Scaffold this motif. Structure first.
Motif, mmCIF file in Angstrom:
data_model
loop_
_atom_site.group_PDB
_atom_site.id
_atom_site.type_symbol
_atom_site.label_atom_id
_atom_site.label_comp_id
_atom_site.label_asym_id
_atom_site.label_seq_id
_atom_site.Cartn_x
_atom_site.Cartn_y
_atom_site.Cartn_z
ATOM 1 N N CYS A 39 0.844 -1.207 0.000
ATOM 2 C CA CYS A 39 0.000 0.000 0.000
ATOM 3 C C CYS A 39 0.877 1.254 0.000
ATOM 4 O O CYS A 39 1.640 1.416 0.948
ATOM 5 C CB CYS A 39 -0.691 -0.132 1.395
ATOM 6 N N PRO A 40 0.775 2.072 -1.022
ATOM 7 C CA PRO A 40 1.625 3.283 -1.067
ATOM 8 C C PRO A 40 1.505 4.207 0.099
ATOM 9 O O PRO A 40 2.581 4.616 0.658
ATOM 10 C CB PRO A 40 1.226 3.922 -2.415
ATOM 11 N N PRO A 41 0.373 4.680 0.587
ATOM 12 C CA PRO A 41 0.265 5.579 1.723
ATOM 13 C C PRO A 41 0.606 4.969 3.046
ATOM 14 O O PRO A 41 1.043 5.694 3.960
ATOM 15 C CB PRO A 41 -1.181 6.067 1.697
ATOM 16 N N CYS A 42 0.658 3.649 3.138
ATOM 17 C CA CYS A 42 0.961 2.962 4.387
ATOM 18 C C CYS A 42 2.451 3.143 4.670
ATOM 19 O O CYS A 42 2.852 3.191 5.821
ATOM 20 C CB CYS A 42 0.699 1.449 4.279
ATOM 21 N N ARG A 43 3.281 3.134 3.616
ATOM 22 C CA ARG A 43 4.741 3.116 3.762
ATOM 23 C C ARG A 43 5.282 4.196 4.698
ATOM 24 O O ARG A 43 6.087 3.844 5.554
ATOM 25 C CB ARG A 43 5.422 3.293 2.367
ATOM 26 N N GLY A 44 4.829 5.430 4.511
ATOM 27 C CA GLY A 44 5.391 6.482 5.384
ATOM 28 C C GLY A 44 4.674 6.597 6.706
ATOM 29 O O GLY A 44 5.240 7.163 7.602
ATOM 30 N N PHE A 45 3.450 6.038 6.867
ATOM 31 C CA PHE A 45 2.750 6.106 8.120
ATOM 32 C C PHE A 45 3.323 5.075 9.114
ATOM 33 O O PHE A 45 3.564 5.506 10.286
ATOM 34 C CB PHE A 45 1.213 5.864 7.913
ATOM 35 N N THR A 46 3.665 3.885 8.672
ATOM 36 C CA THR A 46 4.170 2.849 9.587
ATOM 37 C C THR A 46 5.328 3.304 10.472
ATOM 38 O O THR A 46 5.166 3.218 11.689
ATOM 39 C CB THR A 46 4.533 1.548 8.895
ATOM 40 N N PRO A 47 6.330 3.997 9.961
ATOM 41 C CA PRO A 47 7.396 4.454 10.824
ATOM 42 C C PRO A 47 6.935 5.517 11.809
ATOM 43 O O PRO A 47 7.566 5.554 12.887
ATOM 44 C CB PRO A 47 8.440 5.049 9.854
ATOM 45 N N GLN A 48 5.922 6.343 11.475
ATOM 46 C CA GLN A 48 5.472 7.352 12.439
ATOM 47 C C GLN A 48 4.772 6.608 13.585
ATOM 48 O O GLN A 48 4.854 7.002 14.746
ATOM 49 C CB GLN A 48 4.513 8.372 11.798
ATOM 50 N N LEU A 49 4.067 5.527 13.200
ATOM 51 C CA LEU A 49 3.453 4.726 14.286
ATOM 52 C C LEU A 49 4.473 3.960 15.119
ATOM 53 O O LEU A 49 4.335 3.850 16.363
ATOM 54 C CB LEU A 49 2.395 3.772 13.739
ATOM 55 N N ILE A 50 5.558 3.533 14.499
ATOM 56 C CA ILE A 50 6.614 2.817 15.268
ATOM 57 C C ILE A 50 7.230 3.814 16.241
ATOM 58 O O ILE A 50 7.461 3.502 17.429
ATOM 59 C CB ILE A 50 7.685 2.332 14.268
ATOM 60 N N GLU A 51 7.472 5.048 15.778
ATOM 61 C CA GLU A 51 8.030 6.072 16.694
ATOM 62 C C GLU A 51 7.138 6.331 17.877
ATOM 63 O O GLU A 51 7.610 6.353 19.040
ATOM 64 C CB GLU A 51 8.275 7.370 15.929
ATOM 65 N N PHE A 52 5.800 6.490 17.643
ATOM 66 C CA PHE A 52 4.904 6.704 18.767
ATOM 67 C C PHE A 52 4.868 5.468 19.674
ATOM 68 O O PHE A 52 4.775 5.595 20.925
ATOM 69 C CB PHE A 52 3.490 7.009 18.146
ATOM 70 N N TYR A 53 4.868 4.253 19.120
ATOM 71 C CA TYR A 53 4.800 3.052 19.946
ATOM 72 C C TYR A 53 6.057 2.941 20.807
ATOM 73 O O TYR A 53 5.990 2.665 22.010
ATOM 74 C CB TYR A 53 4.698 1.873 18.960
ATOM 75 N N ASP A 54 7.214 3.149 20.169
ATOM 76 C CA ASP A 54 8.458 3.028 20.997
ATOM 77 C C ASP A 54 8.460 4.046 22.099
ATOM 78 O O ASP A 54 8.936 3.713 23.226
ATOM 79 C CB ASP A 54 9.719 3.184 20.130
ATOM 80 N N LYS A 55 7.977 5.250 21.930
ATOM 81 C CA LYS A 55 7.968 6.259 22.950
ATOM 82 C C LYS A 55 6.978 5.957 24.070
ATOM 83 O O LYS A 55 7.136 6.286 25.285
ATOM 84 C CB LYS A 55 7.594 7.630 22.385
ATOM 85 N N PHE A 56 5.765 5.472 23.684
ATOM 86 C CA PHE A 56 4.638 5.517 24.585
ATOM 87 C C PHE A 56 3.917 4.198 24.838
ATOM 88 O O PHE A 56 2.990 4.290 25.661
ATOM 89 C CB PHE A 56 3.540 6.509 24.078
ATOM 90 N N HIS A 57 4.279 3.057 24.258
ATOM 91 C CA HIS A 57 3.414 1.881 24.469
ATOM 92 C C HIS A 57 3.409 1.446 25.925
ATOM 93 O O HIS A 57 2.410 0.957 26.414
ATOM 94 C CB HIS A 57 3.822 0.755 23.559
ATOM 95 N N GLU A 58 4.547 1.668 26.611
ATOM 96 C CA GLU A 58 4.505 1.303 28.057
ATOM 97 C C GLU A 58 3.897 2.375 28.931
ATOM 98 O O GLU A 58 2.949 2.052 29.698
ATOM 99 C CB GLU A 58 5.978 1.018 28.448
ATOM 100 N N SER A 59 4.256 3.648 28.743
ATOM 101 C CA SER A 59 3.716 4.718 29.573
ATOM 102 C C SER A 59 2.252 5.039 29.372
ATOM 103 O O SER A 59 1.565 5.399 30.338
ATOM 104 C CB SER A 59 4.548 6.016 29.470
ATOM 105 N N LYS A 60 1.734 4.782 28.157
ATOM 106 C CA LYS A 60 0.355 4.954 27.807
ATOM 107 C C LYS A 60 -0.395 3.624 27.721
ATOM 108 O O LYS A 60 -1.572 3.671 27.406
ATOM 109 C CB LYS A 60 0.241 5.789 26.553
ATOM 110 N N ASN A 61 0.247 2.520 28.083
ATOM 111 C CA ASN A 61 -0.270 1.183 28.241
ATOM 112 C C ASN A 61 -1.191 0.799 27.068
ATOM 113 O O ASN A 61 -2.378 0.536 27.213
ATOM 114 C CB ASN A 61 -1.086 1.132 29.561
ATOM 115 N N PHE A 62 -0.476 0.640 25.931
ATOM 116 C CA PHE A 62 -1.220 0.113 24.782
ATOM 117 C C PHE A 62 -0.372 -0.893 24.013
ATOM 118 O O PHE A 62 0.865 -0.977 24.190
ATOM 119 C CB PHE A 62 -1.679 1.205 23.806
ATOM 120 N N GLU A 63 -0.971 -1.607 23.083
ATOM 121 C CA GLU A 63 -0.299 -2.543 22.206
ATOM 122 C C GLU A 63 -0.888 -2.362 20.778
ATOM 123 O O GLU A 63 -1.953 -1.742 20.682
ATOM 124 C CB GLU A 63 -0.627 -3.976 22.676
#
Length: 144
Positions: A39-63
């Motif tokens: 998916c063309p638009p997915c390509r650049g969104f996935t890394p922005q989501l990886i950045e948010f997950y690495d920063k906040f998945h534990e402090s904001k308790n999500f998966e």
């Protein structure tokens, strides 16, 4: 327990080159992430989501649980390898397709957050809202 209605009878999710039990997600907010390696638009969104997950998945308790639209296993696997979170196994693609119709996902990328314990839907628009709020000041971007 609330995730069973979306992934009926799927007891384990992929993680790295292994698996984790769905019951281990008790108490978290869970985002289903519908995307695909093609998916063309997915390509650049996935890394922005990886950045948010690495920063906040534990402090904001999500998966995050990747729900693929890849129909080739290699495409699925190479893409999931770049992600740090979980995935519905490739062999359970029928459940992802059913889930995508339940939430009427008309295009990808799309990120939907549900509460793991109750199954309640929390947000259906997190792919759009995260781009506008990368620090999660308004997380979890609850739907009206």
């Amino acid at each position: 327990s609330g995730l069973d209605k979306y992934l009926p009878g799927i007891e384990k999710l992929r993680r790295g080159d292994g698996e984790v039990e769905v019951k281990s997600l008790a108490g978290k907010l869970v985002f289903f992430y519908f995307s695909a390696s093609w998916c063309p638009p997915c390509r650049g969104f996935t890394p922005q989501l990886i950045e948010f997950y690495d920063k906040f998945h534990e402090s904001k308790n999500f998966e995050v649980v990747f729900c693929t639209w890849d129909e080739e296993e290699d495409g699925f696997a190479g893409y999931f390898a770049k992600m740090p979170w979980l995935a519905v196994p490739f062999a359970q693609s029928e459940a992802v397709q059913k889930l995508s119709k339940h939430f009427n996902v008309e295009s990808i990328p799309t990120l939907i957050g549900v509460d793991a314990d109750s199954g309640d839907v929390v947000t259906t628009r997190a792919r759009a809202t995260l781009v506008k709020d990368p620090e999660g000041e308004q997380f979890p971007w609850k739907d009206a």
